[PDB]
Symmetry: C7
Subunit: 209 residues, 7 copies
């Protein structure tokens, strides 16, 4: 009682399990120290003031990708998990009853998977292409009531920490997602791997006998 094609199931399993694995690896205890951002406060600040400076410049951010990278990986995971979820609803009644129109549904689902994979490839290539030294910046807490007093200085050098691991994991993800696309575009050609529904039924009964 198998409702899917083994190659397509393996592709869906890999494409959605890789970014969650990279999010799990990027913040492991093994590879990473405790603080995400760090700003060099002067030597007249207490603990609480330097914590205020770090917490302010962390919330005062180009650099949007460096902060929200795990959320973007999770978004790619969800948007890539959606096409098989849409496929299950349209498929399981008709195949549960039997075992044209289903060719359109199957081709559109695999097409959406291919487009999401290509957009992930473009985004990860853009993320790796940018300068590694473009992870540090100059923050200024002087705002509001702190605009006139000369106790604090103007510029604060701030540096994100977990960005090099993000570069490396995006390289790994891009390397996987580049060679993942020939498999899905080979499964795109429905009548040759044995556009009518009869061919789809043939390739759905060859493994469910």
């Amino acid at each position: 009682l198998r409702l899917e094609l083994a190659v397509d199931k393996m592709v869906t399993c890999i494409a959605v399990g890789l970014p969650l694995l990279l999010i799990s690896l990027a913040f492991a205890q093994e590879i990473s120290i405790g603080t995400q951002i760090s700003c060099f406060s002067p030597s007249s600040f207490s603990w609480r003031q330097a914590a205020f400076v770090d917490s302010y410049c962390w919330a005062a951010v180009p650099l949007w990708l460096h902060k929200f990278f795990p959320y973007i990986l999770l978004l790619f995971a969800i948007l890539l998990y959606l096409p098989p979820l849409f496929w299950r609803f349209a498929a399981a009644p008709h195949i549960c009853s039997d075992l044209n129109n289903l060719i359109i549904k199957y081709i559109s689902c695999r097409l959406l998977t291919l487009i999401i994979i290509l957009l992930a490839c473009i985004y990860l290539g853009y993320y790796f292409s940018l300068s590694s030294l473009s992870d540090e910046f100059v923050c200024s807490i002087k705002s509001g009531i702190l605009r006139n007093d000369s106790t604090v200085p103007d510029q604060f050098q701030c540096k994100l920490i977990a960005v090099g691991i993000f570069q490396l994991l995006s390289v790994i993800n891009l390397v996987v997602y580049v060679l993942l696309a020939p498999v899905v575009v080979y499964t795109l050609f429905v009548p040759f791997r044995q556009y009518n529904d009869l061919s789809l039924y043939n390739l759905f009964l060859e493994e469910n006998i």
Copy 2:
């Protein structure tokens, strides 16, 4: 043995699972540093005094939305989970026996779902519309016995930290909830998707055969 319509079940599953997912994402270890609020205490304060200042100005709050945002998302989740819970009690006896008045119950439940979705859309639009720089304020601990002594200063610049993630997640939630409403208003029109009970029974037996 299915007691519901697949499209309505999917809509209920998404509308109540999205805000809990956003609450889970907004306070993840990955995206967020440890302290919610931060106030710049002067450099003559110990740790405990600056902790007192932060704990006072956190409890001395417009800004009500910036503090109670997860509770409001949880309230929207609960108020949106209530209509299917009311539907189950009125439905499962009559449909469990069989498989006018039920049209009124079904239409009122979907109407309440639509109204809650629209109110969530209005609230999230209001929450995103306000100024991003309107997250910081000027707190004053001078009250009670601390009204006359000149050891502490008058104004304390305070800043909330997790507010930008709240803006972004409210944008995502609004984007989902805008396009969610055409689906529920399409399911609102009961006789065309095949106001008498016979049509409801037809669309409840087409998927439970």
Copy 3:
């Protein structure tokens, strides 16, 4: 095999599940900073002395409600869970055998539920009515051997932190418990919702057939 009435079961489930949910929400990591009380110790005290001052003024307390609020909510939960627990023992033998005197037991249980709900309403109204600024006070550690030395000062401004969330959650609980009472007083009128036992048996067999 249902031993209860659906409306009464839902009422019992809500009335005992709401205060536990509010206790769970009031001390969540999301909404609340780490320390309950905070007292402004002078700038010549070490960490341990300020911790002693906070721990002394926390244990040197009108303000009784501000400290023991979760215990009072738990007490209302337990006292409201007791009437159905008493109902089960008197009911399940007679109804398990069959399916006057039971009218007295049922009416007394619902009456006790109504009285507990009304007392909860009165207490939460009293708790919300008091001044929000009446959460801070003036503590004095000068007692015992510390009565004569002039190293420590006399007055210490102390402030409770989690009190505004208590005001808001008591408002929510009062709003629910006000509109909960019409339902239980409607279920109080036993012969009209179809004082003899025959009517109770009719309304216990209409849903268990």
Copy 4:
């Protein structure tokens, strides 16, 4: 297949479940700050020296009840759980076979339960009766090699913290245990609630039919 009397089972369940619940409530995160004892060390002591002073005066203790209160509640729980455990061994063979001497066993078990309940009442009354201000004392670390040096002072004011919650929970426990005793002494009178074994068999078969 019920081997007990419902009223006695409920009494045993309450009498042993209340003190464990009070021990669980007295040290909850909600109600209680982190440190049990606190001593005001002078302002020339480091962290480690004040920790040594607190750890010494915590282990240098009338006040025995204030330190070992949860252990005494656990002891009352165990000593009150012992009579039904003794009852099970003597009862389950004879009742498992059948369904004088058993009257003696049943009366002695309920008598021991009554005596333990009364001793708990006396102890909790004594614990509540003592002065609330009798929780703080004067400790002296000057002993051994620290008997002659004048770097440390003689007297240290020390204060226990979790004692007021102990007073309140002992009041609650006493209030429950006072009204618990009429129920057990009513179950003590074996022939009237329908000293021969025949009456015990009658009241053991009326609920196991």
Copy 5:
């Protein structure tokens, strides 16, 4: 299908479950502060130096019993769990087949249990008998390269903390183990509680019928 005697099973269950319960109680969060040992370092030492002093004098230890008390309780638990474990191997074949020599095995197992109980009684009496003030000592870190420099002083007063709880729990354990021995020595007399195997078979079939 019971392979044991109820009284002996209860005795084995209590004698091995009490010391584990005391080890669990002696280091509970409720009763005990965080640090086991504490040494009064002078007021010119940083945190790390005082931590070095405490960690050195904790590892530079009469006092052997005060440090390894939970390990000795665990050793008594294991050595008292061994006789029933030896009994099971020799018993379960012969009794599983049937239901002289077995009298020797049973008497030797109960004898070893009695000897272990008596040795535990002697050790706990010795542990309680010693002076309560004999828990503090004078440690000297001056060794190795730290033998000539006069920056650190010679004597350091050190104090163990969890020793009074050890005295109290050893008193409780001794009180239980004294009155436990009449039961096991009553079970030692095999023919009277109804040395031949026939009597053992009689007292093994009276409860397994």
Copy 6:
């Protein structure tokens, strides 16, 4: 119902379970202190500045192997788990039906396993061969706005901590993987351990009878 050869299954189980075990052992609480990297900051820096220096020089890195060693072990584990995963898909249909071409699949899978084992051997030999003193380096935070000020010095000696355990675990892994290769190359010779499919079927039915 066994779908594999016992020797090959044991080899796959060991080759993928050893590096995960070494990753688990290298960061155990037992063997390792809390901080991975450590840099000697001057004695005019606060806590937060030294934490900034450590967090900067940890993210400013030959030495790539010393930082990403657990990820490389995980990569070897995954790349060595892939050949049996590929074998299962091609094998389980044909063997599930039956019990040339399968010789090619089996030989290619075992060949890929051998190549991955050899590459792991070469990498671990290279990792052990390098100097143990080549774990410490000279970091410079002077960049950006911190290029001209003379408050901070130029050179910072930094040292990785968990590298010696990495040397030892790579030695252990190399010792295992050297003697693992004779077993897999003995299983490579398919017709002698009883290239046609008939011999493979003989050695797949000798253990599944």
Copy 7:
């Protein structure tokens, strides 16, 4: 359906369960303070510098046994678990079919168990024999850029902490493993405890009937 001999199974269970139990006991919260190593840094070092000194001298190590003792115990556990694992593969086919050559396999497995037990005895005797005062040493951080500056001193006294517990647990393990060897060498003599396969089959059917 028992595939083993009870005495041999008990021996394997004890010999592999004892070192894991000792590793679990040596790092328990009860017996051990938080830091493994400790070095007396001078009183002009901040927290981070003393943490750097401790982390450097912990990674700059005769003394190899004092650092890697749990790994060596785990290695003895694994090397002692290997002979029964090898025995299962060679035994379970032939005994599962039936119930010379098996005498060789059984004798070689028990011989390897005896050799591993003897090597463990020799190693633990060597570990206990060495001086208890040989746990402290003199470390020098002066290397690299820190070779010429006179801000830090040359010698640092360092001390391992958990070594006395290692001595005691190795004594316990040696005491067990000495008296464990007569049992395994008694099971080594196969024909007397009833070298041909027939005797092995006799002693494998006497307990599996």
